Subunit: 119 residues, 2 copies
Amino acid sequence: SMADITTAEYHRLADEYLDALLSRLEELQDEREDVDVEYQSGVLTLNMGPEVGTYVINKQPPNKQIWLSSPKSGPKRYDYVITGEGQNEKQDTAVGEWVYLRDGSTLNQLLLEEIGVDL
Amino acid sequence: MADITTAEYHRLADEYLDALLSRLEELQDEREDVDVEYQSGVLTLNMGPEVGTYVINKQPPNKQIWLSSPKSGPKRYDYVITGEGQNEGEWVYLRDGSTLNQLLLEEIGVDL
């Protein structure tokens, strides 16, 4: 999407994001009896229990996307998009986000609304 | 679309995904870029950097198995008894009547 990134750059960005997400969800896992989180090989699994269901969040490297499956709202696909220019016209000052280009929403926003997790 | 309890769903889904896993473990040995994992009701099938990653997961509140394919996108499979067919239930995408086994045959070349 908006960001002009190589596959290697994608992997770094996605790994950084999912590592941060994982540690936030590990906190949630400790506080709640119904929440279990796993992470292996680019795939983050979040079982919210028998009433909520299971979330899957995974790297899709050929598309340079992060894909999502939600039991509340279904499937979505996130591109790495530059939403803020930052300090300069320089691309190294730009703020990038994971955005679902069908509606412009962010992955952070979905997690906040559905799971109460603020990344 | 079958009238089953949540406990029955879990048994049926676990049986199916266990069978699928062992078929994919054979495939893992015979193809260098294929890796399969199965944990907490989620089957991950990484076909490497050109093909991408398949996810196949239980979605218990809907009594479905959900799929995400890098070639053809998301689908939701119900446990369905069709009256075409006899024996001495199948996992079906009810939008077109196809089975999950058929998709895996066509996309990945695994004949289940």
